[PDB]
Amino acid sequence: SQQVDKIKASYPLFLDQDYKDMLAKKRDGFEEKYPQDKIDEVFQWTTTKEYQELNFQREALTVNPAKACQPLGAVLCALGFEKTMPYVHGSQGCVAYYRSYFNRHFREPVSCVSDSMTEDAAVFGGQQNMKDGLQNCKATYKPDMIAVSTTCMAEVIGDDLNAFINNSKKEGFIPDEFPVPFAHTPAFVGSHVTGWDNMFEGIARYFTLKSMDDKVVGSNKKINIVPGFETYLGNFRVIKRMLSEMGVGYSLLSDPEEVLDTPADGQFRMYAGGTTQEEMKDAPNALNTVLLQPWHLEKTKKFVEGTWKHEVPKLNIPMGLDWTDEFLMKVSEISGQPIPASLTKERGRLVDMMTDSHTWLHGKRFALWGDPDFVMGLVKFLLELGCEPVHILCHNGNKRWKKAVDAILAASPYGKNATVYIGKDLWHLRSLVFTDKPDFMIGNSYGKFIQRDTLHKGKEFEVPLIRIGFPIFDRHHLHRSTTLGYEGAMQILTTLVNSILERLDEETRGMQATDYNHDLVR
Amino acid sequence: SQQVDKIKASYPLFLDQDYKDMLAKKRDGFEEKYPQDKIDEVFQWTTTKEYQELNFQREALTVNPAKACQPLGAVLCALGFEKTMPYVHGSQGCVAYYRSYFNRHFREPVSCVSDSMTEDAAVFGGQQNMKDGLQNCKATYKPDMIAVSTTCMAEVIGDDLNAFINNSKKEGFIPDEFPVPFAHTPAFVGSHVTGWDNMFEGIARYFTLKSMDDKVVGSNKKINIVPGFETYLGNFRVIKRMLSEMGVGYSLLSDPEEVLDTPADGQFRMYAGGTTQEEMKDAPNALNTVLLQPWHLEKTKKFVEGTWKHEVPKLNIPMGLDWTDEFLMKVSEISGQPIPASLTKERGRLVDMMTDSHTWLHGKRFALWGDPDFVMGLVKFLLELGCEPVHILCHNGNKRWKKAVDAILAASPYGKNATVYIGKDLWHLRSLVFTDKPDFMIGNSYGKFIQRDTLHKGKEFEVPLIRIGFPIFDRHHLHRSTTLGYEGAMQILTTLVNSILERLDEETRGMQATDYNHDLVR
Amino acid sequence: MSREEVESLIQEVLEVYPEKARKDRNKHLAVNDPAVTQSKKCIISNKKSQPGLMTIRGCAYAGSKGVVWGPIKDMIHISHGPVGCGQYSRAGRRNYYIGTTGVNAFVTMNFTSDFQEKDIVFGGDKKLAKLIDEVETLFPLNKGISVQSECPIGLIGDDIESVSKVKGAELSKTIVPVRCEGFRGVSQSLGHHIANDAVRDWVLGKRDEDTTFASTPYDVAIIGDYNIGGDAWSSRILLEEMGLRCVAQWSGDGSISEIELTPKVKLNLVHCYRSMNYISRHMEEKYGIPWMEYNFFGPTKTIESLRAIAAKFDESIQKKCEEVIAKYKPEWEAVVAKYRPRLEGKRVMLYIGGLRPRHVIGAYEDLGMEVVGTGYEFAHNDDYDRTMKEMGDSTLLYDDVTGYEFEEFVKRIKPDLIGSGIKEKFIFQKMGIPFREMHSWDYSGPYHGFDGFAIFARDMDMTLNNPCWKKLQAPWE
Amino acid sequence: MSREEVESLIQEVLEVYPEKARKDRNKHLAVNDPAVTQSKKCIISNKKSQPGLMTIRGCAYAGSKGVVWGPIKDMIHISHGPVGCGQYSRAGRRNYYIGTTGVNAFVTMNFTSDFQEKDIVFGGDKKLAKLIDEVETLFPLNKGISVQSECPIGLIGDDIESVSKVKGAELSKTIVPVRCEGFRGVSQSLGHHIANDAVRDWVLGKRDEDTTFASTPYDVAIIGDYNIGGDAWSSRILLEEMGLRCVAQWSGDGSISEIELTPKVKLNLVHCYRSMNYISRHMEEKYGIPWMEYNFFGPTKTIESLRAIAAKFDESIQKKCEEVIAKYKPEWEAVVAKYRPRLEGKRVMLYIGGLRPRHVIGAYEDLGMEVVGTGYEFAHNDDYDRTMKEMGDSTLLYDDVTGYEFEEFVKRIKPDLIGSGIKEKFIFQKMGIPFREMHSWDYSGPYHGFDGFAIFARDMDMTLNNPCWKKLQAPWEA
Ligand code: ICS
Ligand code: CLF
Ligand code: CLF
Ligand SMILES: [Fe+3]
User: What is the CATH number of domain D1-59+342-476?
Assistant: First the structure.
């Protein structure tokens, strides 16, 4: 039933007595459900150290991963180029998923095409799909570039992307001069961030490998900036703002912040902004190339060094105070530009906020996950804040990365209770936050289900999620935030201290029970 | 007791059994407390309509006001001028409170002096306090200007500021050319926003009244901006940013942005930035003057129009979409500068966020309070979002203001259930959120106690507070936010939709009860 | 627009294609003609997509794991392959259920074999067997396992059928191998059929030989309702108020137990014909159970369906049918009286999957709105037969519409509302056209039944009449 | 750090002042000398603040409504006058209580007569009587009303005493008029005294003729603990573990009936001497109740106080005193063991109100720290007598320090930590000097007792050794 002037959606409609009775009858009648005492017993067991031990013995089973597959990253990298259509050679189902995944995080259109390979192509290869697909794509959607990656079926069958594209131009399906960079992006290797590396290196190769003879390092007086897999619009914007504030000439290579934030003014813009083909052609003439997320730009690094002859600096992701300081000093050295007063003041405002908020941050314990460069930057900033990053999880991390993070933890007394996990998933993490409970989680929307699990044991045991990372699906417009630079450090600090104070208010809101500590001033 | 490795502060220390038993023994032995059943009975009564009717018959008693007294605003105005010391003529207890009130909101130093009038001066006047005070202040703290207001004791006994200052100069305590603007700021008239108006007009007259003969309207090709009582740093910064983006020459008259955000770099800076004396002296040469908060700048308007001869535009506070549009179009007309592509894009991004978020905001019911201009802009924006501003409270509002808000509500279907209250306080508002429950409160930190009261009735009756306004004491760094322009509309919209989504996640977090609607994607 | 303009529209938009794509796409665009009821004579469907044209279709794994199998709440469903498929589809579809997630229900979890290159080189059958054991140690209350194959499985020569048989026998467990690799078929549709045959072959014949369940003459099953936002609960309530016993829900909030009891029912009530007509036909053939199509979108169709369903039983149910109709009459009439004035005359274009492009037309008409265009991602010709009866004369029909086509049709026809998917929503919102998601219900719903019609109407009104749409134009443009 | 260096630091700082302010401020700055124990040969206090020098002081309303009366939990306190005073002091002081706010307790609420110009012209006495009626209708469970006068009340000739007597008799209600107008006195101090005299005159004697309260040999009152962050609860716990019966707490978490029962106790335990010595003396002269000063800041002072208090009772209390001391011994020793190494040798400068600038010294010394400077906003010479006993040789003492003076002293002495109020916190943070609030405990605490010592230690450590203090200078300057 519904009252017309107070209509109920699923919640709380189904809490009405007649729906409650109906659901109870369905359960008892036909579901052969386990007794509630048995459910409670097994749930309790899943929160114990004994269960954690079985959990960490898993070899074959993955549960609730914290990663995605390569083509997602290649699509995101391709979107950062002017009038470029990302194009995934293989099965169409993947592209429907890549688009929807990004649709839900950015709340924006996401353009990407497939060439719809089916079981037939797995027999005779996908060359005809490439020829017709490239022709159809170019004519219908009018890109100035098509950046080709692959689904896992195309990889297994062994399609030779290079030859297929060459033949598409030879046979006249697309103009010879029309740019069609490509990269093999097997989903069974690495993760989405690897797809980004592979796609970017493919595009760099396409526009520079054959033309190096005329290149002279430093001749354009710019610094190349490679952002990597980046899903906060404010991270593209803050790097460009800082570099502009310093008077540094720069080329941001792969820049999707315009096409992922087009205005609603009565027309749809399939393409917007982006790195020009010309910026990539001219990139070997830069003074140097800076990798904002080096731990998943390995292949890019080797190409920029081996072919462009750039001496890529050893810089961590510019997150927090120390590593933003280090980014700016290295940029200052490469470019000859001094760090301006505006950035120095901005730095001191971040420090001011740290001093103001240190007493609520000190000693707070966090579980956290994400991609390698993001996670280590957050671990670094938390240590700068006096926080303890107890559970550090990077599903797609590696040995060398874990060693670098363990080194950073050992250099601070706020890392003495921390552990770094690689190859572990969010079901592993669920065990850790029951057996070694932290104060909060920092992670993406998949964390909400861990918070639900912890609350079910008890309010005492609940671990609230703080949403920083990718994907964020259950809040709106957090993709506009910033996590890099002093601006991003400011935003993360504010989010963390107020998450702490919001929860303290909740725990002290009980009239005559706990509201003695419900202070007006904190 | 305390366990050394897990020390407990008051919460949750005093939940230990031994403290619980001690407190129960204190109550039973010596407090002669009303029985709990009687406390429960009276509490339920205070949630009733019959209580609300008694509550709204109050005429002499005020409970939990939502306003402060004039000198607080005069201090904030004075702080917006270069190397200016706010100086309150009267008793020193006032100045301790003003500084601490702003200290807690901004988490910054707040410099202000008193001339410490006591029982002696309360019969023979504070002339001698002014003479020594002005000379002591100039010598110890080295301001370029001293801006003088009054506490209520100085107003009652009738101290003549003009004569007192004039005699201080005549008798050699301060140089005759040293600037000492003044304003009478009686606490028993209007509110803190009135003190801002009074102080600003006093400063404006000090620098312009006796020098009008050489002034020519529009000769400096600038537009004056008077911001009024403003406690968000982002609002000073957004106005300057948009006008710089338009290429509009402007003078922001009273600009405390720098003194309220000095860096923590090893040195204390008592003064920073601010409107210069030259800018005030030259201000009559502007094309016009825009009042950002016209409903508490009535005295300023009369001076700007009657003496500077400017035709102050009829502009609402630039909050939300329509009123920012109107602000920009009028500045465009005054300055002859077209609205640039960058601001047009920013507008369209706000509209985009509106379309993305409209299904969760629609029909949401809000109670809200604050200063008149801030409240009516919030009302306006909520209507543009499809929200219902059910309870609209302005303690320091007047009849003419309420008439204008009622006309805004009447023009929208979303105002059909809204009521505007002037002269009412937060104990009035408490009743309203019990008898006519909204979904959320928008207001300052004092609202925390109403949320506490509503939860005590029942979780289903709890009205969560969304902190927007002044003062915010129990969260850190919200004073850095923005509420004006497209940027502030973006921030407000994000806060509102995610406050809604946070609450839905809490109500659907219960496993096997309500988590059927605990969606990953919203 | 009436007929000759639409036909001109179709030719104009297809001018941009290369010759091959144009000749193909010409056959998937048609204008309804009341004098031709046979779709095989005016539109082709269920063919391959043209490469590079930005189809909206998914794959067979979506059809099988995402739609049919995943909602079954007390089984563990394994995305068998690399990590993507299971992650992108983790909890993206709102197939609601009652359970304790991770203990006795597992719908919104992502179980996967996370193929590495070593599994491509050596095969993943050993990994899959070790995986099944690990599932059994950590999730003992699971009532069965399904293995949803991703693209590589069939390509590399793995044999999950043998693994399911060996491990199933070893553990006394229902383990269902599903070869729903995404390269199979042309869309989600073949996934549906593959999943239906897997239910039949591996689940459904297990109580053929069990008869001890206590049957009644009023036992029915809801076939093809995946309980989006609670849709099937808002349908079940009405059927049981009418006196029936809904023994099973396929597969929204569905238990394996319910599915295994379905051969014991007396009537299968098919909502989504496209996705489960297969198993319905099988259950009529082998068990003799009749099936019938129904429609619980909006008062007119819901009332018609209850009466049609009640006519299959005796007078006592037909009496209770009228009691339910009389009970809900004042409620949906108040919804109409409030919302039809706010929506009448507004023109709607739809594009969805395999059922709703036709199934929801009646609800829109119950609020005075006109569906001027509709289409499917993966419908077959029998779906289009049903569609032409429900669509108006000279309305636009499109099969496997391209992004470019959909954009251009909307620009010319200028609907007041669009209902489609997440990949379409933000495109048309930026063009200033109100949009409602008609897969996820825009995180609202239910829309089925009388309780759903009120939410549906509220939702169409809040979006169509929202203030945000009049503000896209800057006053200075 | 030598006496001669401090004395010329004082002279150099005062060079900036005009003639008159120079001579006055010189009187309020001193270097501690063990050869001088009288203070009245060394420093002047409790005088008016020099105008325009940015004193940190508040007013007599703060000392009366903010400090003494405001915490009384089951009375309603009217801020009588314009709207400012009641608003700026709403819930700024963390005087903790247990109650149902708005029903039977009212501490964090702001009741006010919200004076308008009409009330200045005609007077507020009629408005006050109407307001009392409105309070009775809307807050029936209040157990008494107090009227806290703001500046205008005395200035316009209002007679709140008559209103209080008339309405109190009509409604059979205790209604206390307090003439704590902010222009009276020189500071919060006179507000304490006025507030104390108002308790004595209108509340304390109500039960002089009653005899139904059941007394015991061990009845005490905690006098002058306002329960900042639970401070008084963490003190009461120990006294009752020691076998005493704490009949009343003045005035943190205090009820009016507790106040009324205090003349029935055997001993008044005075923590804050400055603010409540007035009423303690009254209760001695009238009811013959002895009073004694004690100190629960840190384990050394807490142990000494517990023994001194127990020595006023019998063998049985003294034995339990040693049982309490033995119980908490491992706890506070674990605190010192963890935190003293992290704090020892660090130098502290304090500036607070009337008690803590001396009372917390022993706690810092229990953690190896040294207080090289201290001072009060509004202490009297008997406070400074007690301070010289606690403070070290050749340390700096300042009375009613100016903003400029405090800044200049800190720059020269360069202490590792400063403990002062909110108007000071953010100045010295920007200078790179760790700061702890020693009024509000920076929203932490309790700091009293053995349980409060653990929090205190934890709090000084977390701020003094925080990573943020290394970060204030950019690597490219630097
Ligand atoms: S009453 Fe006094 S200023 Fe003794 S007015 Fe002040 S809660 Fe201070 S040094 Mo705030 S004489 Fe209490 C005090 Fe001390 S408010 Fe608190 S900290 S121990
Ligand atoms: S048609 Fe095939 S079954 Fe369908 S959704 Fe694509 S793979 Fe999967 Fe892409 S998303 Fe990545 S590359 Fe493979 S693993 Fe999962
Ligand atoms: S010494 Fe000042 S007034 Fe006087 S009793 Fe003390 S705080 Fe108050 Fe409240 S109303 Fe405002 S704050 Fe200034 S002017 Fe009057
Ligand atoms: Fe600060």
Answer: 3.40.50.1980
